[PDB]
């Protein structure tokens, strides 16, 4: 219940690493065991801005921008994980760090765990969140369920007591359902067919739900040919007594993602109070199978992430429960204003260890998971609900599996837990350091 700062009031520091300049934050005292904060994709040290001030009064905090990100230089690299390994190894040695406490997130966690496995004597504790683990099968993530889609026939807008299809299309047009101009409608015995192509997955889902939410429409036959889908939702039927908060609790496991559901159902839904029993709503998956399937290709994936900047304009806001402000979005946008600079954002999801590929990353991540499961190193695991990379059920398993591990529930959270509860994360790190022997 407190304001979250947007500013980045850290003096810039730069250091030569393998002939390139890396930017880093360096605050706090000069001489103790330092904390090394490692960010992931598509962030920078900016993601740590509201955590570090909880620790900097008593401990040195070092937060680098990965090569090719933040304010670091942008060499002509493929930006494979191994590139990041080489630069981060050289960064640590260029600063003369000996012993460290790691605080790591997302791809920063693969860097930190891989460095800790190789240098276990130099790691005094690891705080981590929304981290990389091997995913054995694609069915770890949900997929868009294929139609036909069934609706509560009598529920929705009454358009009446060839004619039916026209009233449906004009209703989509008048209510401003995006890309209604691209679809045509057929209605027969309460069954609607929606046909078209060139629609995004989001636009198609909004059209499908809007057609189903007409009084007298019992089912919608889905003939809408999309681009390659890069997100997906489930369809939820509103019950009597429902609120968006109750629906969020049921589907996401936490009530505080209510505004995500509201936003996902505009323009057809005008305010949260206006849901009605029998209404269908789209509820975006926290992480759809479609997303990394689309990203992990050299045609669709590069068009989305390089040409359209989807990791910054779409995926990043979907990784935060609260709405990011324009000031915050601009800080995240700044290193990637040129598309030619977006290579790391595409290579990173293509390095994720999913279903055996890429083999080198799968092996390396299994290796540091094996190390972590037998290591007595102090561990602090932050998790949120519903999560993205680490859902609550996985967090619970790891809290019991990992030795010497304290787990902290931060409340609602997706991928950037630092953007949803920085005060809890910073103050829990600060209290945990006193148990480390540093």
The residue (of 151 and 332) whose beta carbon lies closer to K ion is 151
Nearest to 243 by CA among 284, 281, 207: 281
Residue 217 lies near K ion (rule: CB under 5 A): yes
Do residues 383 and 129 lie in contact, with contact meaning Cβ atoms separated by under 8 Å?
Answer: yes
Nearest to 391 by CA among 402, 380, 400, 383: 383
Of 35-43, 108-116, 214-222, 230-238, the window that binds K ion (rule: CB under 5 A) is: 214-222
Q: Out of 68, 108, 125, 156, point to the residue binding K ion (CB under 5 A).
A: 156
Of 57-65, 210-218, 224-232, 256-264, the window that binds K ion (rule: CB under 5 A) is: 210-218
Minimum distance from residue 182 beta carbon to K ion (Å):
22
Residue 151 lies near K ion (rule: CB under 5 A): yes
Residue 317 lies near K ion (rule: CB under 5 A): no
CA dihedral 423→315→288→385, nearest 10 degrees, is: 10
Minimum distance from residue 432 beta carbon to K ion (Å):
52
How far CA 277 is from CA of 67, 152, 154, 156, 242, in Å, comes to 51, 9, 10, 9, 8
Query: 85: buried, middle or exposed (CB in 10 Å: 19+, 13-18, 0-12)?
Result: middle
Of 9-17, 127-135, 154-162, 187-195, the window that binds K ion (rule: CB under 5 A) is: 154-162
* Calpha distance 387→390 (Å, rounded): 6
Tokens 């090569």 found at: 67
The two three-digit tokens of residue 193, written as one number: 């067919």
- Size, binding site for K ion by CB under 5 A: 4
Residue 132 lies near K ion (rule: CB under 5 A): no
The residue (of 279 and 418) whose beta carbon lies closer to K ion is 279
- β-sheet bridge partners, residue 53: none
Nearest to 129 by CA among 152, 153, 101, 110: 110
The residue (of 235 and 336) whose beta carbon lies closer to K ion is 235
Ramachandran sector of residue 106 (left: φ over 0; alpha: ψ -120 to 50; beta: rest): left
The residue (of 157 and 179) whose beta carbon lies closer to K ion is 157
Of 3-11, 144-152, 392-400, 427-435, the window that binds K ion (rule: CB under 5 A) is: 144-152
Residue 47 lies near K ion (rule: CB under 5 A): no
Residue 88 lies near K ion (rule: CB under 5 A): no
The residue (of 151 and 285) whose beta carbon lies closer to K ion is 151
Residue 210 lies near K ion (rule: CB under 5 A): no
* Residue ranges in contact with K ion by CB under 5 A: 151, 155-156, 217
């Amino acid at each position: 219940m407190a304001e979250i700062g947007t500013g980045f009031p850290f003096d810039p520091h730069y250091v030569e690493v393998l002939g390139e300049r890396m930017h880093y934050v360096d605050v706090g005292p000069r001489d103790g065991t330092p904390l090394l904060f490692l960010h992931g994709n598509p962030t920078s040290s900016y993601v740590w801005r509201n955590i570090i001030p909880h620790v900097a009064p008593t401990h040195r905090c070092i937060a680098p921008d990965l090569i090719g990100m933040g304010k670091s230089d942008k060499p002509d690299l493929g930006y494979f994980f191994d590139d990041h390994v080489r630069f981060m190894d050289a960064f640590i040695e260029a600063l003369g760090l000996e012993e460290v406490v790691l605080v790591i997130h997302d791809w920063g966690s693969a860097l930190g765990f891989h460095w800790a496995k190789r240098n276990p004597e130099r790691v005094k504790g690891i705080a981590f969140m929304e981290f990389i683990r091997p995913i054995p099968t694609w069915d770890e993530w949900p997929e868009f369920l294929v139609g036909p889609f069934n609706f509560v026939k009598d529920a929705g807008e009454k358009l009446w007591e060839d004619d039916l299809a026209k009233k449906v299309w004009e209703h989509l047009h008048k209510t401003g359902i995006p890309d209604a101009d691209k679809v045509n409608i057929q209605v027969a015995d309460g069954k609607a067919t929606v046909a078209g192509d060139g629609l995004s997955q989001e636009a198609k889902e909004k059209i499908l739900v809007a057609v189903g939410n007409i009084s007298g429409i019992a089912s919608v036959d889905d003939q809408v040919k999309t681009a390659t889908p890069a997100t997906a939702s489930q369809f939820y039927t509103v019950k009597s007594g429902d609120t968006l908060s109750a629906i969020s609790n049921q589907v996401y496991g936490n009530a505080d993602l209510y505004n995500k559901i509201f936003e996902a159902n505009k323009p057809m839904l005008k305010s949260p109070d206006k849901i009605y029993p029998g209404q269908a709503l789209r509820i975006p998956y926290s992480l759809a199978r479609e997303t990394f399937q689309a990203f992990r290709t050299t045609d669709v994936g590069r068009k989305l992430i390089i040409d359209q900047n989807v990791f910054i304009e779409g995926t990043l806001p979907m990784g935060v429960v609260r709405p990011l402000t324009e000031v915050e979005m601009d800080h995240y946008r700044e290193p990637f204003l040129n598309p030619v600079d977006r290579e790391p954002l595409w290579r990173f999801p293509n390095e994720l260890p999913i279903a055996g590929e890429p083999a080198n990353i799968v092996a390396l991540v299994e290796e540091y998971m094996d190390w972590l499961h037998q290591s007595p190193v102090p561990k602090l695991l932050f998790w949120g609900t519903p999560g993205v990379l680490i859902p609550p059920a996985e967090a619970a398993r790891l809290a019991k599996s990992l030795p010497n591990c304290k787990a902290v529930d931060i409340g609602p959270g997706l991928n950037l837990l630092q953007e949803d509860n920085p005060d809890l994360i910073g103050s829990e790190i600060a209290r945990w350091l006193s148990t480390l022997e540093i």
